[PDB]
């Protein structure tokens, strides 16, 4: 049975009144430090701090110079030299921006994606390795220290339509991607080819050479299945050695490549089988671009629906049916919940909506 109970302690609506697509707490902040999160919507990036008695303190606002930009995602990192926090944002333009959260200044940007960017994820061990997933059918790996495009994941056996999500595993040995082509693809980045490609990107010096850096083109995934969902796959995350993915079917499917007893690291690229282990059911989440989330220790799973309900499950409960905690509803929360974020310690859950509203749920 589920233990976790929450209480809605505060809400706010942003001035632009545009949909909020993404939210992320900064999990790099040191124990004790004020709990900060960023929200993205329209051509805005906004920072907030969480104080006692459900107080949400506005810190800084970033308004993009391009009025037509529509941010879809953000991800936090830190500079590996200065220990300074960094925030990457992207959207409709297909331009990645590295923002200094303290000054709200665009430090650097990366062009190259031929279409919109749906997701940005930083490597769990390397703060410089940023992955971007795009409408151009590809995923790209960047080294934001050397400003290089390390690799492009797509081509011959890559995605055949817009890529919607991706996730690194806990240790960052492999990435799982998914898109509109209904497929879920595995790309190992711990292969000798990729580990060397990563090293090469660190050795690259533009003031010591005239030739630009040569990115790797990964045309072939290490695993591919179109047998989990019957439609578009808009969200994917690793749950240990298992996968969690959703479509429009009002369920988060928990599965693994190959047969039940197959090892994730011994799965051959040609693997034709796939094992479905369970399902996390909900309702009113048939619209596109609705992401689920997990807390750091991967104990809680959260997903918002199109009507303002926040479903929460206890991932320590073996059966996904007796794992569902009390749904987090507030009679005033009625618009689509696009994304949720747990604070590092899982004491706070923030939810963002289509009506520019933020919702703070504090654990009991």
């Amino acid at each position: 049975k589920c233990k976790y109970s929450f209480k809605c302690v505060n809400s706010l609506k942003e001035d632009h009144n545009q949909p909020l697509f993404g939210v992320q707490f900064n999990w790099h902040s040191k124990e004790g430090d004020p709990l900060v999160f960023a929200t993205v919507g329209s051509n805005r990036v906004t920072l907030y701090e969480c104080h006692s008695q459900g107080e949400i303190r506005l810190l800084q606002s970033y308004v993009d110079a391009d009025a037509d930009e529509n941010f879809y995602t953000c991800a936090w990192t830190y500079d590996s030299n200065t220990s300074h926090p960094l925030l990457a944002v992207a959207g409709s333009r297909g331009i990645i921006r590295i923002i200094n959260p303290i000054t709200m200044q665009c430090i650097k940007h990366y062009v190259g994606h031929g279409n919109a960017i749906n997701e940005l994820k930083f490597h769990p061990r390397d703060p410089n390795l940023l992955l971007s997933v795009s409408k151009d059918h590809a995923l790209r790996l960047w080294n934001i220290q050397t400003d290089t495009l390390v690799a492009i994941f797509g081509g011959v056996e890559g995605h055949r339509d817009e890529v919607l999500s991706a996730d690194y595993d806990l240790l960052g040995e492999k990435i799982m991607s998914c898109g509109m082509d209904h497929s879920l693809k595995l790309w190992r980045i711990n292969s000798k080819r990729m580990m060397n490609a990563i090293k090469e990107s660190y050795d690259y010096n533009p003031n010591k050479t005239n030739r630009p850096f040569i990115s790797q083109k990964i045309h072939f995934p290490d695993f591919s299945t179109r047998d989990i969902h019957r439609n578009y796959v808009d969200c994917v995350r690793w749950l240990g050695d298992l996968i969690l993915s959703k479509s429009c079917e009002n369920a988060i499917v928990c599965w693994k490549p190959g047969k039940m007893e197959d090892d994730i690291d011994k799965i051959k690229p040609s693997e034709s089988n796939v094992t479905i282990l369970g399902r996390f059911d909900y309702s009113q989440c048939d619209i596109w671009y609705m992401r689920f989330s997990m807390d750091f220790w991967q104990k809680m799973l959260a997903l918002g629906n199109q009507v303002g309900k926040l479903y929460v499950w206890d991932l320590e409960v073996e059966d996904p049916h007796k794992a569902k905690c009390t749904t987090l509803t507030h009679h005033k929360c009625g618009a689509a919940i696009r994304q949720t974020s747990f604070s590092r310690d899982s004491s706070i859950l923030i939810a963002v909506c289509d009506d520019a509203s933020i919702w703070r749920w504090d654990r009991l």
């Binding site: 900064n26 790099h28 902040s29 040191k30 004020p34 830190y78 926090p85 806990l170 240790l171 240990g240």
Partner: peptide, 29 residues
């Protein structure tokens, strides 16, 4: 079971990331 086995994998791997986080002192924002 597969569940309990997957659960320990998460425990150990999140513990490796948590230790690396503890050894870090990221400046406030």
């Amino acid at each position: 079971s597969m569940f309990s086995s997957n659960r320990q994998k998460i425990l150990e791997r999140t513990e490796i990331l948590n230790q690396e986080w503890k050894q870090r002192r990221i400046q406030p924002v």
